[PDB]
Design a binder for this molecule. Sequence first.
Ligand SMILES: Nc1nc2c(ncn2[C@@H]2O[C@H](COP(=O)(O)OP(=O)(O)OP(=O)(O)O)[C@@H](O)[C@H]2O)c(=O)[nH]1
Ligand SMILES: Nc1nc2c(ncn2[C@@H]2O[C@H](COP(=O)(O)OP(=O)(O)OP(=O)(O)O)[C@@H](O)[C@H]2O)c(=O)[nH]1
Ligand SMILES: Nc1ncnc2c1ncn2[C@@H]1O[C@H](CSCC[C@H](N)C(=O)O)[C@@H](O)[C@H]1O
Ligand SMILES: Nc1ncnc2c1ncn2[C@@H]1O[C@H](CSCC[C@H](N)C(=O)O)[C@@H](O)[C@H]1O
Ligand SMILES: [Mg+2]
Ligand SMILES: [Mg+2]
Ligand SMILES: [Mg+2]
Ligand SMILES: [Mg+2]
Ligand SMILES: [Zn+2]
Ligand SMILES: [Zn+2]
Ligand SMILES: [Zn+2]
Ligand SMILES: [Zn+2]
Lengths: 852, 852
Amino acid sequence: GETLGEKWKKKLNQLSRKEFDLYKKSGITEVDRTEAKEGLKRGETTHHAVSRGSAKLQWFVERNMVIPEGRVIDLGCGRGGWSYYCAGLKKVTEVRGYTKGGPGHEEPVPMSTYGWNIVKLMSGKDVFYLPPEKCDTLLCDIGESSPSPTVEESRTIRVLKMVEPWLKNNQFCIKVLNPYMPTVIEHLERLQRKHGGMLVRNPLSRNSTHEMYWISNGTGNIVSSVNMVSRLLLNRFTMTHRRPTIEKDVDLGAGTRHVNAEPETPNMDVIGERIKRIKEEHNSTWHYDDENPYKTWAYHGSYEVKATGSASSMINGVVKLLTKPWDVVPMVTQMAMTDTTPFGQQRVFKEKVDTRTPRPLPGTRKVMEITAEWLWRTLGRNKRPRLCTREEFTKKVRTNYDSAKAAVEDEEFWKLVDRERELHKLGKCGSCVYNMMGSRAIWYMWLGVRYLEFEALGFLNEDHWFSRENSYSGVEGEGLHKLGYILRDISKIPGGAMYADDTAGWDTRITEDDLHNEEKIIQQMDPEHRQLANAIFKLTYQNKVVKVQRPTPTGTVMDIISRKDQRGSGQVGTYGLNTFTNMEAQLVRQMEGEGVLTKADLENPHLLEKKITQWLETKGVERLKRMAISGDDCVVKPIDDRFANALLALNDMGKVRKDIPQWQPSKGWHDWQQVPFCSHHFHELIMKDGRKLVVPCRPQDELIGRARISQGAGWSLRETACLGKAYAQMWSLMYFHRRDLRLASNAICSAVPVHWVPTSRTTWSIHAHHQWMTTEDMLTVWNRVWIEENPWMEDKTPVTTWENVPYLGKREDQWCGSLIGLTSRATWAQNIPTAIQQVRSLIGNEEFLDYM
Amino acid sequence: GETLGEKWKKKLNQLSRKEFDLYKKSGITEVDRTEAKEGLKRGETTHHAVSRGSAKLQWFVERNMVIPEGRVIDLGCGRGGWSYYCAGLKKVTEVRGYTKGGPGHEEPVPMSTYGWNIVKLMSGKDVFYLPPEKCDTLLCDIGESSPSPTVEESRTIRVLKMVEPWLKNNQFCIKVLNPYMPTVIEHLERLQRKHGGMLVRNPLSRNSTHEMYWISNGTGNIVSSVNMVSRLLLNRFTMTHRRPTIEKDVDLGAGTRHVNAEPETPNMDVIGERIKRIKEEHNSTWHYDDENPYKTWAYHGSYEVKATGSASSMINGVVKLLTKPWDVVPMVTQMAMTDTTPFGQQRVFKEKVDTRTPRPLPGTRKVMEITAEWLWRTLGRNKRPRLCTREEFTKKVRTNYDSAKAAVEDEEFWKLVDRERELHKLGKCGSCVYNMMGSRAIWYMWLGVRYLEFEALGFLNEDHWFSRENSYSGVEGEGLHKLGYILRDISKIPGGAMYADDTAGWDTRITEDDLHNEEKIIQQMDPEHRQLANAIFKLTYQNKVVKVQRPTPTGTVMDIISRKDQRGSGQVGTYGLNTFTNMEAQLVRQMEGEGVLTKADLENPHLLEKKITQWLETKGVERLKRMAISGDDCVVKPIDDRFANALLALNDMGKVRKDIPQWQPSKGWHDWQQVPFCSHHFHELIMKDGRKLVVPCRPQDELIGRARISQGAGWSLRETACLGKAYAQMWSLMYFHRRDLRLASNAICSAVPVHWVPTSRTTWSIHAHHQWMTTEDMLTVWNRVWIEENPWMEDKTPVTTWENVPYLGKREDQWCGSLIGLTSRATWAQNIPTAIQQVRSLIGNEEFLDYM
Ligand SMILES: Nc1nc2c(ncn2[C@@H]2O[C@H](COP(=O)(O)OP(=O)(O)OP(=O)(O)O)[C@@H](O)[C@H]2O)c(=O)[nH]1
Ligand SMILES: Nc1nc2c(ncn2[C@@H]2O[C@H](COP(=O)(O)OP(=O)(O)OP(=O)(O)O)[C@@H](O)[C@H]2O)c(=O)[nH]1
Ligand SMILES: Nc1ncnc2c1ncn2[C@@H]1O[C@H](CSCC[C@H](N)C(=O)O)[C@@H](O)[C@H]1O
Ligand SMILES: Nc1ncnc2c1ncn2[C@@H]1O[C@H](CSCC[C@H](N)C(=O)O)[C@@H](O)[C@H]1O
Ligand SMILES: [Mg+2]
Ligand SMILES: [Mg+2]
Ligand SMILES: [Mg+2]
Ligand SMILES: [Mg+2]
Ligand SMILES: [Zn+2]
Ligand SMILES: [Zn+2]
Ligand SMILES: [Zn+2]
Ligand SMILES: [Zn+2]
């Protein structure tokens, strides 16, 4: 009675080498380690998982199969993948790793990922020589494979006997190398009867091993689950080969972890009513989950929900046909491995949102205070804040998931809005919640929340408070086709290089002090407006209640959480307030670069404001004109390059830069064409006419890949073609200078009917003016944008033909991702009208023209 | 009358391209930019000169041709080479750089070199469009070459007219592109009559340009100096080609400069008498130079002296013959471009010694205080401090520039010693001075100073206070052949990796607090010993008076300077006290890694000692055994790898690591054979006998190059051969495992007489026990060292033949610099006895044997 596992093993060994290489990865889940390995080789110590182990453990922890807590002990820690992951978990307070080390064995790798200060990895530690210790969590990942089952059998038994005395009513996750051998089966059943738990297969395990993990949190039949894996591994022999499901690797953050500074203290007076109403509306499945993972957000309860969100995306057919050589390239397809599974949201939340920014120094808070007041007064020198209305909100909803067009039309919606507004006037909030993305009550509430925000704070956008004219540094309403010109104008200002540092997760870096300073605009409001805005700032912006989905072993739930600081990203006015605070922060950094702000000043509990006020009143506006600031994105050209080393205030404010050590000097550009801004850089093109154009540009694969993703999860063909045409129109207006794009532009537009009007939206950017969704000829639209209404184009004489509309320099094209070098492109370039003919065959018999 | 410069220009253009490439560098001075360019390309912002310009300006400043001070303005600053150099000069308070920038023009490069916080480099600044400003120093390096003299003529005149209004009784250094054209000559004479100054040729200028510099500090004939350059450039056409004199590039340090924190405040009560006696002994040339460059050392006066010190070295003939393929390699010859010119000392002093360490935090001082007291008590648990004597000092001088053998024999020397000692007992110091390396008064004083230091503090070395047995962490008296074994033993201790961070200029990082803590050993001394040691610590160690040479336009002078902290490197007890403080510092870092010491503790003005005392009394010794510490060099194997990120205390103590950003985590090893220690790493070699040897090793070129440098600046041939034989004996005893060395070992020893005994010293290291300077057979000496008296060699049965004395693994040999791969080595390998025959022909007819 040679078991199924032994058959699988016998078949596994009887394989060809390439028949083996095929099978061992067929259909499994696998993390992309490319960035990590490249980062690790350059000696980086932050963010990176030290091995594939971090991701492997994540899978168990995600599903609460093991919940690391208290003192964690990690046997055979190796490089430390499991240990570093545990360091950032809510209830973990200490991690001890033991591993053998020496020749032929992995060695602990020092890192500075989040919680490193509670991780103690020791090499030279053979666990089979170690006396058991007290711990709340026991991890073990030891097990060396062997082509002989009985060899693995003895190795597995050895592990189990070593590891058993470590177990005592505590969490555990233990690797069982060979679980199908009958003697091992017998030992596990004895183990399960004493310590509980169950065997689980990890999808990240290759098919070349039958390994499973004995986890503490679960029950079930050991013999059953083992054969279930055996069967699966057997079927994966005969079945057709499936390349691995590629998964994004883990981000473990950076810096020391102070556990006692993590927990959130909610203002229950403010957010209480909101929780109660949610609780009442979902009373039948409402519960309080003590196993929630939230370290930094206050948890108030959960209710059950249906599982939403796929871990993939759905591809636009028409444009995938006409861009055939890009099925070859990774990035265009890598953009389609989006993950909005409830697991994916939870991973993003932990790694990006579940953090706390240390309170800025008293001197730093003073500078921000002074600068903010000065900035708001400057921004309101001409304009006044005003209330927006139902009428106004309705029009914008009409013109621009939208049954919102029906909601704003339903009178009962506005009745609810009125009801909630009267609460705000009394200092109460009843239903203002947002999501990390019931009937229509849930929908009306949410849309009513956004209206009240729009009503009180919408003027910032609607009245263009951050236009360049009104804000000096702003670019609101300008458009992607003008941004390049603005950067060119900035480069003409004498001083240092042009700097463009990205903040790591800007919205999560907004402090309580930032919120306090953004709030000061209410001082310029009329009384009734003021109390409404004051309600929005205090009740919903400084006390946020959030809905977030979370997978559980028993099903998906919706968690109700709260947080005082950070930016509510799903809230109206995010862009303006981000622009405001960023403007302030970049002024503060400029003061530091110029020596007006010193380290002593940041620490000084009673900083003198005469110096700051003086600097702002004499140089404030001039310094604002040195900047281009769009939300969290910024370009700064300081008066000299001391700015590069000005890091004290920037870091203390909490606006830590992305992808660079906290205290490493910044690096800028003097060639304004190499400067990144709003996901673009900008090139200067001299036309044959002699006149100059400044055009937006970005990596081509980013443009190709975004277009091979259609809207509507279940789209037809009349829409998918119309979406593809919209991208084509965009490409011919904004990226006409890219050879592949303009050619692929003339491919889509001739493979889609002329009576068809481009539907849906290309991308959602505030800089997108969408001039490419129109009635009209693409050359006539082009002339209007780039010549006629372009203020940086002196001579206005139109362009009659498409080839005095220039391309990029050819080498410049290739450098930005053009494929015109490869022969695969030139071949794609002759299969042109065949590919056209192929899609127009799918669509049917309508209006086709031909585009060269 | 076409001038000499115009002839030179006419000849320069009429040259072949390779006849030009030859001439343009023939005989000029040139800085090695290789490290800088490689560093700059990796984005490093410290230490590196941004261009060759820093070195070029240095040449002028060195010779006081221009003395940058106050507000410095730098026209055509370019990358900023001149500006960054000025930032670290004594009297400079602000540096403003203006440069054009844009296409075809150099751009300012942001750096973090010392004084960056007073450097304001602005691009987009055309100086021919700029109104003149007030400044104390005007620098200008503008001038574009042209094959046409008259073109250069107009460009030069343009510069002169632009630059003249900037001049007003201030320092200046202005590039004069073409100085030989008659009209330019005429303009310069007019300029010189108004603003003074003179023209100077810079040796770093290529011969392809006639450029000179109008500097403010000097007078002389413009027409004369121009033709002097013309003549020189003309002669360099016909003369035989000389490859450039290669010079070491500039080191501009790192960090912010706080000018007001730089000046030294001398204790004139303590050091006054010493200055007075020096002043009296050199009263005829004694003066007070206000133009001294010392920012951080107190200056007290100068006297004139003869110029000492060459900028090159003198090569050992015998071993250069027998290592012919290494004339090809750079590093062996690069080791001979030593520079002990008075310029070189001044460059080293400015860049390395003329710095100030910020006072450590109060909490940090407490930890050091507690740890030091605990450490001294541990070190004195068995031994007592004792006085050393005249007899003892004499013997060591007899057995070991030494007319010191005559001085200790002269009774009048000891009379002076007694006289100075009686002052010390009264709390006075009269003649205790040392040097940065008159009659014999100067010599007796100095040697008498070192005796009194030896008398009071010599016990630390003479009684082996830092032997491994007595200090746990120490390696004094162990020997280079045992160090490797000690590291192997340390690797057996479980925990983190083995760390080996080098301190940048350890002796200059010794704080007043370090000195205070090292002083505590006097508490264990007898009264008479105590007052003598107390005199040494307080009068000469904590108040140092130093003699240093400095070049001036009029001649070399000797400056008398002083400093309270830092280690007197030319003083007795340096090694022991460095070992002590390093032991302490590495314990303090281990406390931080283990969490015993926190950031709050460092800042806490009244830190609690119960925690530290507890840690030391229970774990202190165990942690000491995790370390190998020899002076400023250390190897630490912490209990885990949190140590790598433990940087707070280390930096705050002032012991900043070398060649790594101040806050970047350290990187260690687990392979103990890759760990650097005492200029070596150590390999484990299994003999054919089966027994294992652990041997010292280092880059081979470092060993080759050190041996191709003889002692005695004017050596004969009987000594140079004897020095070469000493190296050969060393190589066969310590580096027998290196194939080239053991072969070159058997080459030197057979090319040098057997009746000749190896003279002089190989290298000066305390770990060198010099077993290679002996009467005896090299195999019998080898057996004694590696087998018989080796405690890590259990079986003691001797080795009869030289080829069970193993080599390194062959790939391991090549990796450490072996040349056995190249065919140039294999050819060197057959010209063996010819090369032997060649030297034995120089020596004469004596005892030659032959060595295989
Ligand atoms: N038929 C066949 N079986 C193999 C081969 N290599 C390994 N195996 C079997 O697969 C089992 C586990 O494979 P591992 O070698 O541990 O893992 P892997 O998939 O080869 O990946 P790596 O070990 O990282 O190279 C072994 O116990 C072998 O029985 C092979 O080349 N051919
Ligand atoms: N005969 C000859 N003269 C040259 C050549 N190149 C430059 N010169 C002369 O040398 C003068 C200065 O040389 P530069 O070109 O400024 O400097 P360089 O030595 O060539 O070094 P780089 O400019 O960095 O390439 C010019 O004004 C020319 O008159 C050449 O190739 N042949
Ligand atoms: N007897 C033993 N004692 C301690 N560690 C051992 C051991 N035998 C093997 N090991 C180590 O156990 C490790 C298993 S791989 C562990 C990977 C780790 N969980 C991570 O996420 O990175 C190997 O590196 C191996 O060196
Ligand atoms: N009209 C002008 N105004 C300002 N700078 C100019 C200029 N014309 C040329 N320059 C700049 O002057 C520089 C001379 S090379 C200067 C090197 C600099 N002293 C250093 O040590 O690094 C060039 O980089 C050139 O770009
Ligand atoms: Mg394999
Ligand atoms: Mg950006
Ligand atoms: Mg040249
Ligand atoms: Mg070292
Ligand atoms: Zn509300
Ligand atoms: Zn581009
Ligand atoms: Zn003295
Ligand atoms: Zn070596």
